[PDB]
Subunit: 260 residues, 6 copies
């Protein structure tokens, strides 16, 4: 479509992957309201498409996303913030049932990092950097920069990053558990698309059920989480993809999932 801040395209073999590239080189992919609206529109379009099984979110080679547009929230008041719910538009990735992979290249600072943390899988470039510089501007991370970061990298490093604003390299993020894989800067997006293809090659319903079961780990106790996992495992037996996969395992061949 006519997107002036993002570029949404169907990549990957058989056009099974959705790539949304934030295109704002003049502001280091600053997450303005219009950019967030365009991103939500692209996510809705890719989610309602039966061919796209996975989505890949990426930015530029120099900066993935520098965070919220400080120029816009400069004159905002407490009353305005509480009335308009400024950052409610940002929590749309959390509702996307299809897996989303974040290809983080370059600066992932503040909201950007938070954005990367809202995705399911994060692939970081060799020169990628993660930071929470909100404290340097008299603000705190307000879109998941303390909850998800603390749960992922622990209390110590999360506190350090949030109170000092120091940056961590892709290697530190991978060692702490924030990112799962490190890839070259030039092949990051390609490996992300390959992973998205590997994901989409499976049944979409089972993929969404597994995503929900994994997300439940941060919302429920271990016992209730295990019970919900058991209920979802029981429910998977009602789909035809489970039977097809089990028959393709018993009988030596490949499975053909119909997404039902």
């Amino acid at each position: 479509a006519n997107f002036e801040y993002i570029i949404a395209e169907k990549r990957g073999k058989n056009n099974t992957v959705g790539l949304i590239q934030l295109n704002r080189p003049k502001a280091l992919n600053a997450l303005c309201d219009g950019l967030i609206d365009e991103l939500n529109q692209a996510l809705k379009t890719f989610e309602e498409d039966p061919a796209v099984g996975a989505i890949v979110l990426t930015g530029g080679d120099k900066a993935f996303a520098a965070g919220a547009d400080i120029k816009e929230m400069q004159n905002l008041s407490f009353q305005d913030c509480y009335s308009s719910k400024f950052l409610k538009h940002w929590d749309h990735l959390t509702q996307v049932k299809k897996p989303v992979i974040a290809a983080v290249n370059g600066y992932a600072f503040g909201g950007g990092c938070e954005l990367a943390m809202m995705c399911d899988i994060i692939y970081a470039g060799e020169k990628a950097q993660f930071a929470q510089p909100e404290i340097l501007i008299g603000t705190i991370p307000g879109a998941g920069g303390t909850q998800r970061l603390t749960r992922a990298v622990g209390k110590s490093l999360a506190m350090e990053m949030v109170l000092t604003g120091d940056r961590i390299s892709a290697q530190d993020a991978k060692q702490a558990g924030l990112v799962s894989k490190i890839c070259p800067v030039e092949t990051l997006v390609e490996e992300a698309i390959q992973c998205a293809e590997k994901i989409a090659s499976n049944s979409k319903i089972v993929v969404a059920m597994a995503k929900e079961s994994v997300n439940a780990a941060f919302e429920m106790t271990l016992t209730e989480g295990s019970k919900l996992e058991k209920k979802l495992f029981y429910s998977t037996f009602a789909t035809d993809d489970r039977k097809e996969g089990m028959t393709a395992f018993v009988e030596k061949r490949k499975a053909n999932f119909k997404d039902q």
Copy 2:
């Protein structure tokens, strides 16, 4: 013992360790109903012996446990799953009050990894591999594969493993936090038995209290968890082992615990 799927024996000097080795090289230690029943029987036999203080669960050098038997759950309906409470036996391992050490060698896929994750300590071989290939057969984990895994390796790697089924290495499992030690393939079981001995040489009641206090970290908030830990610490003063150990420390001697 007339066991056809497992081998249970007392090991370690003074016979204080219990070793249960899964013996089914023809199915890569597929966790069938009979195998799980034999495992539960061996656990209950070692959990009631006043000599065994710790248990060590291991498999073959080629595969620790391939998971549930697909050939058994192939022709299984949702009604059957719900009525029979399928996979209930698998949770019995979590009821064992004595520490259980998982010596994972080779393949630990699906229900196997969960099994290793249901133990307190996991020792992995240099060539050991963990994975959650449920998605490849049209199903999802159902015994804590998405709950315990996510709480140890983070959201990114857990999501990746659950949605793609890719295998992780022992070094990756240790760096993420799934396993604690990487032992040679030829000495894994020996070091696991030595750790079980070291654990069993302490007060059994205090060991169980510590295990419960550690497990409570995944079921309660930090404040209530710390309060329960403090209550257990107060309760430990009712046992004679605490006074014995403290008097041995103050007198610079060895403590002879009586398990009471």
Copy 3:
């Protein structure tokens, strides 16, 4: 003031860091009642100082803190423990609103480790060692040794340490996520003071808000934690430091915060 077990002073340029050094070489900084009382007094003094923005807690070069005074709890009964509410003085550190950095050198065993775990950021020396030897004396941790450690280094390593009492090196602590950075034994305290300076250079109210937001990650679910974080982010707009920092960023100048 006149302290027998600790030394409290103001370090860092402009006298902005509060350094509390435990001084008890003959007992390896054993956390006795008097030592804890003096530590609480120093923490209260530094928290009520408008010039101190961060506190640095450290011990000796040989041992940071060996744990509670076993000599004092040897003849303690269950009734005495529950009537006196033992160890509650230790939780005062968790009530400090200002950030506290733990510079751990040498032995950090038992309560000492818990002490470091009660702080926000932990800096460990190259030769620092962490352990939980409570099980070796017939007791268990009672000040978060099984709750924070489990959440930090995972279930496997936490269980191993708690049930065996073995020690982990500073490198293992960093790889597991218990500590954030490793510094030479000669510059540990200096680097900790330098980090505390950077921390205190920001708005104190915003720093406290960020600390509360990060701490909320261990007391609430992801949804409620994120909602509380959003509410605190909205509230930050009521302070003048937020507007000052945002204007300095827009104007490309240094922000002169005033703690309001």
Copy 4:
């Protein structure tokens, strides 16, 4: 608007209340997809008007709402429900910032009860009846009929109603804590509108803050709930309505709130 399933109009003096009356006497106000869409549209319209401070949801004198249209979900399959998320649109009531009062007359069965339970205040007629007859049609509540009802009336009565579908009278609903006030059939709507006026006469920002604080009681522990309540109380001081009301009370005069 040209709504065909509901009637939305401004009521109360100064047009401060919004009234949405479900109009479908041929199906006992069955909650069909079109009716839910019209209800959500009316809510969004009333939630964006700076004059409407409260909303009153009501139905007919014979039946408030008979629940979802069974004739529409008759042929729905498990995959269809999982993919389309049949009962997702119903949750919009939970996202309304302004308070909503439910005027229940006659039958409030199944969804109609859940809908009433999704509102903040419930006023029932002298002859109103509540029930959960899902069990009688081979299904269970799916919009909170087992969570809110159990928290409101308790485990015993909730279990009874859910497993038998027996109807409870407005008197038994007030005695159990589900209904707050019982009114005559011919005066229920007027008293509900008077209560909505009393609510809207206050500062809308503080009203929404108090609504959120009350809702937080069912989402977090008592300690974190009280901490969030204290944080919201601190934040209320940033508004002008707080100081205005406090000065009007200290001066013994009327307060003129301006919603800021």
Copy 5:
């Protein structure tokens, strides 16, 4: 049967109700280990029986249950309690998938109340009395007396009953939320059996699903509870009883559930 402490019978038309009556009038139905074992055996028998859809638990006309056997627990010690895990067998009632109705006649003190609180529905007689006199004998409840009671009657009444040991009448329990119906002493068991028949008349799988969804209210937050309820509602469509009932209603006829 060969039982000596209880009487287990199949009552109700078509023998669809399971009646377990405590038959130890010489000790006011003291809950001894043998009585609990017989109760668990009868519960397992009635659960494995496909004809039984609901269970009714009752005692004598003078006393339902006086609680645990004070004579058996007199010489117990802390070490014995911790090693044998006293009162664990009592939790079997919480694992019964089929609904259980408690017909409380006469005294229900201590455990007898907790047992009654472990069931899904509680029918109390006009002369029934509930109390927690454990405090009068130097111990606190240990089978949910402080957890389930507080969640039903409120903090004030629960605290009063637990600390003073005072008794509450059946009317007080009905007005608080502990019991759902009050019946004459002569027809209590008959009305309980009628309710059990009405419950069993529905599909057993959906009844168990609804019971689980209701129990979920006391284990997770409102959001996760509603999500689990919605997932169970989706899963109910995989059964044939849902479609059967919906078609029977659409065709204006009675539904014939086959429990599948």
Copy 6:
């Protein structure tokens, strides 16, 4: 001592009850800083006294407590409220380990009600009235007025009370679950003192353990709550009062508890 705003005395036979009466009829017992400080001092004095087993908090015949002093918080700003941690002195009442009974007479509005809600048992007079008028001044409760009230009287009535500032009589408060007993205005304090005596006539350690178990119901899940209750029940066996009471019961005699 010389208290200018309260009167603390030892009432009840054997001087086993601690009565604290708020004496400020000119401001309807408005809770100010000095009044709260004196209340905390009296509470600490009565808690440290080995003879007082229970405390009774009461006010005047016309008003129990009209809430916080609006005259002081009038000119308070957000920064002041946040830096000073306003109203934390009110939480000390929740830290009292001994039971506290609230005798409410006349007006119990806002903070006062919260104060009554902070106690364990609430005895209300025939003319007592409870309300949350914080909405009528432009603020919200800040001492648990929305959490405890919502957990006690339900959402439907708590929302109304918080958004309208309406007064509920002692009868409604008792029917909803906020108060446990209604007594004449002239005999309220006497019955409260009698209940305090009945409570103090038991083992103080067991009473404190029971209070802790009951309070745990609002901080943990049902399963973890039951496990903590079981742990406390096991710990009670370490005290001598348990054995004494059990022997007195088995021997049909009066128990002589030694508070140990």
